[PDB]
Amino acid sequence: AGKKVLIVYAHQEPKSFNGSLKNVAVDELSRQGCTVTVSDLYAMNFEPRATDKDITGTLSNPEVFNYGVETHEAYKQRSLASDITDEQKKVREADLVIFQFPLYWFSVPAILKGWMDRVLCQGFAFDIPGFYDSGLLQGKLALLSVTTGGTAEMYTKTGVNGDSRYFLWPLQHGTLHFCGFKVLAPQISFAPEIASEEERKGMVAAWSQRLQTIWKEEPIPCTAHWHFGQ
Amino acid sequence: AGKKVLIVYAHQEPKSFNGSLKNVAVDELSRQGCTVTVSDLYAMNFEPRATDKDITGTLSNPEVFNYGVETHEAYKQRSLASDITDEQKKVREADLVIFQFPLYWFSVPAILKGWMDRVLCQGFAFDIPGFYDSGLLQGKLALLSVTTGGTAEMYTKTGVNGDSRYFLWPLQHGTLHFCGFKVLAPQISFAPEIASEEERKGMVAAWSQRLQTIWKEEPIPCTAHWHFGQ
Ligand SMILES: Cc1cc2nc3c(=O)[nH]c(=O)nc-3n(C[C@H](O)[C@H](O)[C@H](O)COP(=O)(O)OP(=O)(O)OC[C@H]3O[C@@H](n4cnc5c(N)ncnc54)[C@H](O)[C@@H]3O)c2cc1C
Ligand SMILES: Cc1cc2nc3c(=O)[nH]c(=O)nc-3n(C[C@H](O)[C@H](O)[C@H](O)COP(=O)(O)OP(=O)(O)OC[C@H]3O[C@@H](n4cnc5c(N)ncnc54)[C@H](O)[C@@H]3O)c2cc1C
Ligand SMILES: CN1C(=O)c2cc(C(N)=O)nc3c(N)c(Cl)c(N)c1c23
Ligand SMILES: CN1C(=O)c2cc(C(N)=O)nc3c(N)c(Cl)c(N)c1c23
Ligand SMILES: [Zn+2]
Ligand SMILES: [Zn+2]
């Protein structure tokens, strides 16, 4: 770096294991000389609901509200709510977007789901047609750093939870790839709450160490075969 | 039937295709004599964020906030916010829970993701142990009624989106089966915006017609093989 990174962070507690993973990511990428910005969604009280308040001024069809159409037209006419445009500018500038979050129901916490729903709008993140490899965020990298309650053994193809790759599909493929991102391999820190004080220190250190050489990684082939196949 | 149904509905616009599918479900299950309740999350301005405002009493650990630990303890103590217990009463009474929503990033809209995050807490919907076939909502049925932008061709194993069942996994397996529901086959209404007025009417009618015999259906085998094959 010479590189800009955005960390989109979704945890309530600065003292949490997620808070420690976000802080070491800021510490290490800052040390390397990278430009670093963090969107701390709970501290921002980030609005998750997709509503007509996301368009300023007058609606494109006030009779029948269509969120997708309204947001697409508002984006083209620079008429989105400023909380959304502020995130868009951070994404537009970033070379890498890291998402740091605890797994909630095999997915992102709703506050982070709402960041994907509201910030990655038509006209900004993709066009129709104009998605997956034609997506408007091509050239950028993305990485999921997730923590779980379930153990690694529970997250195997024949464990109770299935392979972790099975829950990544909607986030890596349906969201990040659809927008044109190249996807770096996920960082999955399994079951930190029932690990010891060491162990948790270890996982934090492994993430710091990985970040040392993050710019030398190639992306995954974000395919059904990678997620589901043999 | 002789049965109670809760419809958890996530669409901003009553005149929408989702709105029509929600209304026809209420119409047909009412006509059958069933007891029917709808949680219209956007009309309720349903809170999606998992925060410390969801607990009203003394926290177990006021120094380091852990949402899971504090909501489990608050469920037991009856100190959860009333919007969450209002939803829990609806679920507790229901024999079948239908989720009606447009697909957002291969998942539920954030407002609905927040209902899952905040309503299905430990102690209410599962315990550890007490999950998957031992989950606390055993005996209840759930059904996802989803609408998409992508066509059915795009949601096939060789199409750009992958098979439709791939995105269902975090919802049907990671959430509904984990809480002990038996899951009925999803209702997927593909690409209503693309379709003719006649084809849209046909999709609404197919859902109404299916609901006529819903109580005779068996659940799917909510397994990795059913979602992913081989
Ligand atoms: C609504 C909801 C839904 C969920 N759904 C799922 C799901 O579908 N699947 C699933 O597997 N799990 C699920 N979980 C559990 C959740 O993913 C895990 O609880 C979460 O990932 C744990 O991460 P955390 O940062 O909150 O842990 P924390 O409790 O913050 O940390 C774990 C321990 O690490 C300590 N710590 C903090 N910083 C450091 C450091 N630098 N070094 C060492 N230790 C440190 C803390 O003091 C603590 O003792 C769910 C939880 C909730 C609330
Ligand atoms: C944030 C966001 C993320 C999304 N992510 C994805 C995704 O990952 N994958 C994906 O495939 N799609 C995605 N979509 C597209 C979304 O799933 C579809 O736009 C939504 O499913 C369409 O449903 P609707 O009810 O909003 O449609 P509507 O626009 O209401 O329905 C189309 C038409 O049906 C008409 N209609 C209403 N009622 C009836 C009736 N009774 N009979 C006949 N016609 C009727 C309406 O008047 C309208 O003209 C996304 C959209 C947004 C906004
Ligand atoms: C605390 N906690 C866990 O440890 C854990 C493990 C798993 C799993 N392996 O699927 N899932 C959950 C889940 N859905 C919720 Cl809401 C939760 N609060 C919790 C877990
Ligand atoms: C409007 N719209 C679509 O028709 C459509 C289809 C597909 C898809 N994967 O097939 N995905 C999306 C998507 N992620 C967004 Cl945000 C959206 N606004 C939209 C679609
Ligand atoms: Zn992909
Ligand atoms: Zn299952």
Swiss-Prot record, chains A, B:
Molecular functions per Gene Ontology: chloride ion binding; dihydronicotinamide riboside quinone reductase activity; electron transfer activity; FAD binding; melatonin binding; NAD(P)H dehydrogenase (quinone) activity; oxidoreductase activity; oxidoreductase activity, acting on other nitrogenous compounds as donors
EC assignment: 1.10.5.1
Subunit structure and binding partners: Homodimer.
Catalytic activities: 1-(beta-D-ribofuranosyl)-1,4-dihydronicotinamide + a quinone + H(+) = beta-nicotinamide D-riboside + a quinol
InterPro entries: Flavodoxin_fold, Flavoprotein-like_sf, NAD(P)H_dehydrogenase_qn
Note in the entry: Uses dihydronicotinamide riboside (NRH) rather than NAD(P)H as an electron donor.
Covalent S-S links between cysteines: none
Keywords: Cytoplasm, FAD, Flavoprotein, Metal-binding, Oxidoreductase, Phosphoprotein, Zinc
Positions bound to FAD: 11, 17-20, 103-106, 147-150, 155, 193, 200
Broadest EC class assigned to this enzyme: oxidoreductase
Stated regulation of activity: Inhibited by melatonin, resveratrol and 5-hydroxytryptamine.
Record protein name field: Ribosyldihydronicotinamide dehydrogenase [quinone]
GO CC terms in record: cytosol; extracellular exosome; nucleoplasm
One of the protein's GO biological processes: quinone catabolic process
Sequence positions that bind substrate: F126, D127, I128
Gene: NQO2
Cofactor note: Binds 1 zinc ion per subunit.
Subcellular location field: Cytoplasm
Role: The enzyme apparently serves as a quinone reductase in connection with conjugation reactions of hydroquinones involved in detoxification pathways as well as in biosynthetic processes such as the vitamin K-dependent gamma-carboxylation of glutamate residues in prothrombin synthesis.
SUPFAM superfamilies given in the database record: Flavoproteins (SSF52218)
